[model samples]
Target: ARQVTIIGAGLAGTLVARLLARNGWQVNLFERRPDPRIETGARGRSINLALAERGAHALRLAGLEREVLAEAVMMRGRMVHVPGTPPNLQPYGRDDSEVIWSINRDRLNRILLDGAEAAGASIHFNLGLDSVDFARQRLTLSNVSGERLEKRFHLLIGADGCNSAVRQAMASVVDLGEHLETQPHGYKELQITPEASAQFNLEPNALHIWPHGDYMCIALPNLDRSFTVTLFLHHQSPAAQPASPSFAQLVDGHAARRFFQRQFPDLSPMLDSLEQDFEHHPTGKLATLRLTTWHVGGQAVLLGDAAHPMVPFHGQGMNCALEDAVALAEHLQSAADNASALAAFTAQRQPDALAIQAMALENYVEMSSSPTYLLERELGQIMAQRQPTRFIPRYSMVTFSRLPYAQAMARGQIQEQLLKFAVANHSDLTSINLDAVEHEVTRCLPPL
Candidate 1:
């Protein structure tokens, strides 16, 4: 059996290892950190991730979808928190069944690792890959003991994260133009501790968003009855500086006291620990990692964040990574030669990855600063509700559509352009003709 060395035991790595091992290949998975099940190192971060239909579908194919779903908290829609207004509810679909879910990342990873081990993949903890010599099919690695070791493998899958050594090594041999565009925004996590009696302060079945012009905070429900709140702010905003006296100054201005008193009164009390959380927790920079190619040869290929790291706005990074694992494994299993398999994987995957990356970047703008004007919001909501089959919001298209990312994105752009044109000409939205617009959009959409 051909042996494959998979780097980084994150979601993508584990899935790839499991697939290869199940296919009768010898799989060796290496992780830089100690076994997550035994270590508490991955704590304090936003342990939860929002999983939608795409991610769920991939896990189902892996035979672990139900198990992961059982541990997840279903989020039916977005609960928009507007200052001086009762939170607005926006359901994901006409029915509650069409909803996304939130799952603990650490727990999910452990489950996948356990399943991979059961499938006969050998997982080595604290083994860090230092370099890859494709010419000799050798990899130099260092364990926790700091001893260097060289290993040979028939194939190497670089599921390592954004700063992947495998990708770097492959770039040296091939002209792989890789670039990362980091947004000026960064995010920090906070907690919404449950009320003494109630399990959740807000509705637990919905993702919550508090968009405050220049910045925004979102909260996703967790199984423990608490919420994981993440605040995205400009990296150089005054609130990010040390001189900001209070969280309110960061959230609102001199009118902050009254704003807090009237709006989000419950959250004000939680601000006591906000500063501490901001000070201690690492600020996550939002970035999109793009690559011209994903593989040098059948010997080495990139997957997950290494292949395409996108902003978290669309929540498609994990889903897309899992999809990549499935696609690559299928290609490898069927190809006449290793080179053919690698070529096919890249040809079919890069377009989708690029599509999702673009959609994800656009989502940041929508989430952080969407039009709050009542008429515009009404127009968007009306259009979204009226033509559910033919029209979908960019967010819904990215999260719910089963279409490939490239197709979804193409259709979404057409839909956005149509909406903009229609909205611009119609001052009286109530009487705006949407049927004509829908027909035009249908023609604009590419074949499914």
Candidate 2:
């Protein structure tokens, strides 16, 4: 039987493993940490993930969509919380059918692993990829005890995340043309317990956001009725904006508390452990990674964060990774050989990866730096209703549909310009001429 070895056993790895195994490939997966199915791992940098359409499609392909969705919490829209005023709910779509889901990352991983095993993929835990020899098609793996083992693989797949050993090894032998653009902002995860209320302290079916001009805080609901809150702020105050808050200025828990109290007074009271969580939780850096190459012949290939890692502003990291797994599995199963499959995977997925990375970064600016364009978005929604196929909102394209990211990016740019043009002179939606907007939408955007 044809065999394949996968590194990382993460979202993409296990998922792809399940896919390959179901297709009759003997799949073996390795992970550096103890099996998360049995062991309680350390607190992760992120415990929650947003599951959108792309992710759902992949799960459906693996026949695990229902199982995974069972443990997820529905997030209908963003509940914007501005201090000194009442919170407002911005519906993600026209109705509940278009909503995304908030799922526990660790639980999702375990479910994927279970699916992989049920599909006959063998998984080895506590074994990390130590080195790779592309010339000889050999892999060296080591465990926590420093014990090492050597194995020859029919094919190798790297799903090992942003700090991927497989990626580093591949880079050592060849130029992958890797670049990392680190954002100036950093994030810290905090928690909001549901003890303040019966089941949820805040609205259960909404993603809460407290957007300041230079910084923002977001909370995603969890299955345990708690909320995983994250604070995104600058690492250092820009010289021109000395008054802005920075991680440098937040020396400790007290400083962070004060900052939150001033900027996010409405949310502060809900976080009973704000001071301690601030001091104890590690600050995570945000960065976008791009690589010109993702495969080296038939011997090895990369997917997910191993190939492209983006910021979390768009909530597409895991979604994009899951999409990669499905694409790769299909390519490998259909192609004549492993080399052709990998080459095809890189060629096909790279453009989409770059497109989403660009959009994700663009979203960071919209969420953090710019003022809310309520009139534009509202007008865009109206245009969407006017021309559903052509004028779908960018967020809906990315989240609610299976449209290619590259195509979505291109269409969204056109739609954005159209919306601005239509709502340029009018502050209210009623003042805009619907017939004129319809003419532009019809002329500029083709049917989906």
Candidate 3:
């Protein structure tokens, strides 16, 4: 294709545009909002994202991994902050190499946007897509002043996000059994300002999490010594029965302050705006967007949240999307025709998308309700230590290895079963049966 039109200048869109442009394909990147480099842009659903190996691989493909990682904070593990106990560091993997990162969403997007421009792609701001006519290979985009333009493209990508207008329009031309499922949980963004000495308020190396049975709050470090924290709660908490713990219940500043004092007592002093931030900031809803078809032959395709919108529980949404961009670009270069390339992209990515989506959904329970499952997490680590090749935690496989999502998930299921069965009647790993664990692991897993 001579020119490819990418609708959405967000992370996935910009990354894809840059990859395509660097591959000798002309790209036009369209963003609905104004440029963050110039104007204060809209911070979509979540403010920060956990960047993993999958996403880093895509950026590395464009020779921008070091550039992006330079600004991100490395998270060695999850610091589970329970009320009655000291902050516990739950390591994500066996060692330091298998770690994740917490990067500012806006900064990451700006980096990719800059990369796209440097790679010779044209970027349009305030040029929101109104709709697309895939059959005619045309798009209708509008600006703030109601000025509209009908643009044509050889290939169109819908990276617009969960509520994708491009995906909506393409469905008119192609049948895509679309489904949107909203979660009962919603999230609110809060922040922890720098200390008076311009230093971090808490341990900055790990992802700080305050897991309260029904809901949870997580904080990721920022370069400016600040922390962007998010609180995920049910739309209407069953615990606060008569009142209900929700956005509606916590609307008033007094109620929010009181709730914080009661539930997350230790975090109160660390919070700079507390009630002000809670009362002022917007509450974002979490949901999953699914589609039966991701492509309309050669002319159109969907990527990222538009293709498989996932809840942010597992923190693989952006990583998966970045992977999708790289895969689509590579498939296009390798395939004989655009239609076949698009189909291949869909076939290759859909399972991984679905797998990660399920994990993201399941992790909500593990993070919010469970105790970070330190006992189980440690068991997996021991098993990994005992058998190098055969045993790795599901988290390790997902964030560290380049293993397919489906395989990682499949093997993870068996590994978890082995962990459970090994420790089923036993009190701890000290009393567990290594022979049985090894037998079951080798029986099911074979080798990586």
Candidate 4:
């Protein structure tokens, strides 16, 4: 039987393993961590993921969507919390049907691993790829006890994450042309406890945001009624604007609590253990990774964060990774040979990868910097009302639809210009001309 070996049991790796197993290939997956079912690891850097349409569609192919969706908390829109005022709910789409979902990262990972195993993929936990021997077409594997093993692969897939051991090995052997951008913003995980009644303390079904212009705080609901909060703080300082403060400034509990009080006044009361969580949690790095090459002949290929690591501002990381798995499965099935499949996967997906990376970076500003004004909030709602089809909000285009990211990015630019024109002379939606908005949208943006 034809066989394939997959590295990293992450969202992309496991999904790809499941899809290939379903397609009748013998799939074996290797991971460095202990089996999550045995001891699901860590509270460090829990960036709760948002699952949108593209992710759903890909998981549907593996028959995992319904089960995963049942575990997810539906987030209809962003709940923007300004310092002085009551929180405002900003819808992400024209209607509720376009909403995204918030799901625990660990739960989702376990689900994908379960799906892969159910589909007949064999998974080996605690054994990691130490190195790849390109010349021998074999892998050097090691465990905690320092036991080493060498194994040859019929074909290899690197679904490993941004710091992929597989990616590093491949790059060392050849020119993978890795370009990386580490944003000078760090993030820390915090939590909001449920109230005395064991019910949610905030709105039950919304993503909460505290936009501080230079930095921001966001919370996504969890299944147990708690919220997973993350704070994005600036690490790099500008000469004139010490305004963008780093996590370093908050040396300990007292400083962190005071910082939270000043910057996010509304969040203080809800965060029961604010100082404790702040002082304990380690700050994580945010980055964008690019690979000019995603495949190595017919033997190896890269997918997910191994291929592209995007920022979390847009919440497309998980979704895009799953999409890559599906696309790779398609190319593998349709091509004449392994070489053709690998070639096609990179050819068709690289442009889309770059496109989403750009979109994700752009979203960081709209999320952290624009929320005080609620710019995307108002712009998305009004433009969506005026020209619903052609001017579909970029969020809807990326979240609700399976439109190619490149196409969405292009159309998004046109729509942005139109919205700017509509709001150019007007202070609010009431003053904008719907008739003129329609005229300009039709003239500039093509049909969906």
Candidate 5:
């Protein structure tokens, strides 16, 4: 019988566990946190996930798509809120078929957990991997009550997270050439309740963004008619009062309130608990983790954030992780052995991981305050309509299709340049020459 040890029962861990177990692998999962299925509340750390097509395909593979989608709210497009003006919708695609869904992270994790156990993956909560002795094929894990246990395994999988113990342990014996790029940006979670209005205080079908030059605030609707809002700002400045603001200036809730009142006057009223949320909730730092390699032969392997944790700007971290889970399962099940499977997995998946990481970081800049973002977006859409197969929008490729992340990033770059050149002269889409755009598209882009 095939047996494996999986560390971390979060999104990636649970999904992979279910996948492997269904393929007849005896899966044992260890999680640091208590069973979330029994607990009911917000962790205050989650920035509601935007589930795109990549994640949906993975869920459908695990047979949990219907259950998860039941709890998710449809987000048709981004509702851009410019100061002193009414917000406008930038539709994600031509229709609802291309829209993404906003889902509660905790709720989705619970669904994956349930699905994993039903698929025969044994889960042990409150137990975390303490250390790994790869030479002896043994590992140590500790429980919340301070009980320690050593276990021998056929194979070990790390789905721990960005700050992964398995990755640390693997680095001890072998140099993975790990590099971490930390973003100075930090975020605090807030909420917008429906107390002041109808079922939703703001538009229910759109993801709202208040994009400032250096900092920004975005919100996603929840199934309960509340919106999970996140305010992203820098930790500090190099000197005393720089041109742009940072969290250093907002010393307290009152300061935070004033900052919001000045920058996001339109959203302030909806955030009834802004002061309290800012005062109480801890600020989260963002970082991207990269490594030269992602596996340790047949003995151990890493997936999800453990392998390639990325920034959340593009909202594809979980979606990418889910894709990793499915790919890993196929390789592990089809290959002649675990070593070759892991080797192949790393060889094939690393490029896509790096591609998405780069795109995620690039998105932070676009989301911040691009004066031409709307104009370029319009041009891209118009071109996409003229050359549907050749000139797909980057966001649509990344969100609404199953194209490989690396290919999407590459094609998106070419399309971006095309749109930028076309929009440099014209302010409106009506002035752009559709025939010229189609000719360029035909020359620059090969059919998908």
Candidate 6:
């Protein structure tokens, strides 16, 4: 029987293992950290993640869709939290019920790990791969006891995260053409505590956004009647000045007080341990990692964040990662050789991944600082409602559509250009004849 070795027991790693094992391949999974189920891991962190149709569909394929959805908090749209204005509703799609969801990331990982193990994959926690000998199909690992061991496998999958050790080792042996770029922004997570009665202070089914011009914050609902708020800002701005500061500077100073009083007024009193959280919780840097090649001679391959580390602005990273795993497994199953499989997988998915990465980066501007244009927003809403099937907004296409990312992105660009042209010509989209625009767009879209 052919055996596969998967590194990193996170969502992507576990999902790939489960898929491979179910296909009659013996799977061995390794993780750097101790088993989350047995040990108390990181606490009071940004425990939530947004899940959309893409991710939901992948879970359904894995036969755990219903179970995963059961533990999630449904988020319909952005509940804009602007001072002195009634919270504006920005629906994610044509209908109000067309929603993404929020789930605890840690819990989700735990569940995926368990599912992988149950699917006949051997999961080894506290075992980290130290190096890879791609030429020999061998892996050197450091186990929980701090002892080194080496093992050989038929194939290896690198599902490790942004700074993947597996990819690093493979790069040393092959010219993988890898590049990692970190953004100027950093993020810090905060919690919106529940009321004394354990009731949610904000609408439990909506994601809240406080988009202040230069820097912005967002809150996603959680199952525990609370919300996880993430603040994205420049690492060395007037607000995050001094480049580096002591814990005291982060917790009790002007930065904390001013931010709370100005931007997150309603959430201020709810945070009991705001100072401690800021002082202790590590600031996470956002980055995009790109690799020209995903596999080396088909003996080993990279998937998920290992291949493309996209920023979390668009909420498509996890979804796209799962899709990559599915595509890879399918290609491998169909191809006669590992080289053919790797080539086919990369050829089929690289363009789409690049498209989504660009879209995700564009969304950071849209979500965080782009001033909402009333005309465009209203026009988009009307078009979606009037012609749900014929006309979908860019966000809807990216989130709700099953169309390939490159195709979706290409169509979206055309639609946006037409909309902008219509606006510039002083033609009210609702009043003006749209026959020409419709025809031009339909010509560019996939056959209906």
Candidate 6 achieves a global lDDT of 0.78
Candidate 2 lDDT over 231-300, as tens digits, reads 9999999999897889999999999889888888888888889889998888998899999989988888
Q: Estimate each model's TM-score.
A: 0.89, 0.95, 0.94, 0.93, 0.95, 0.91
Tell me the alpha-carbon RMSD of every candidate.
Answer: 4.0, 2.1, 2.5, 2.7, 2.1, 3.1
Tens-digit lDDT track of model 4 for 1-448: 5689999998999999999998888999999888777753554335578899999999888898999999898898999888668777877766778788988787888899999999999999999889998888889999988899889997899998988888888887679888889887889888787671144248768888888888999989877788888999876676787755777688887888888888887787778887888877788898999988888888889999988998888889889999999999888877888889999999988998899999998987777753324553476566667667777877788999999999999988987777666677666676666777778778988877
Task: Compose the digit string of candidate 5's lDDT tens values, residues 1-448.
Answer: 5888999998889999999998899999999998877855755444588999999999999999999999899999999888778777878888998889999888899899999999999999888888999998899999877799998988899999988899988987778989999898899998887664243347889888898977899899887678889999999865655857898888999999998988988888887888899999999989998999788888888999999989899999999999999999999999999999999999999999999999999988777774467788767767777778999878889999999999999999999888788888776777888788778889989998
Candidate 1, residue 218: Cα displacement in angstroms equals 1.1
Return whichever of 1 and 4 wins on lDDT.
4
Question: Which candidate order results from sorting by TM-score in descending order?
Answer: 2, 5, 3, 4, 6, 1
Model 1 whole-model lDDT (C-alpha atoms): 0.78
After superposition, the stretches of candidate 6 with alpha carbons farther than 4 Å from their true spots are: 39-46, 196-200, 238-254, 370-372, 385-387, 427-431
Evaluated at residue 78, the lDDT of candidate 2 is 84
Q: Between prediction 1 and prediction 3, which has the larger lDDT?
A: 3
Query: For model 1, what is the error of residue 76's alpha carbon versus the real structure, in angstroms, after optimal superposition?
Result: 0.7
lDDT of 3 by residue, 205-288 (tens): 788888886788998887766888899988775654756577668767778788888988888668768788887887888898
Q: What pairs collide in candidate 6?
A: none
Misplaced by over 4 Å in model 3 are 39-46, 196-201, 238-243, 370-375
Candidates 4 and 6 compared by TM-score, better number = 4
* TM-score of model number 6: 0.91
lDDT of each: 0.78, 0.89, 0.84, 0.84, 0.88, 0.78
Candidate 6: how large is its RMSD?
3.1
Q: Write candidate 6's Cα lDDT for 36-126 as tens digits.
A: 8876544634578888888788788888788898989988888887778878677676565578989988888888888888889999887
How far residue 380's Cα lies from its native spot in candidate 5, in Å, is 2.6
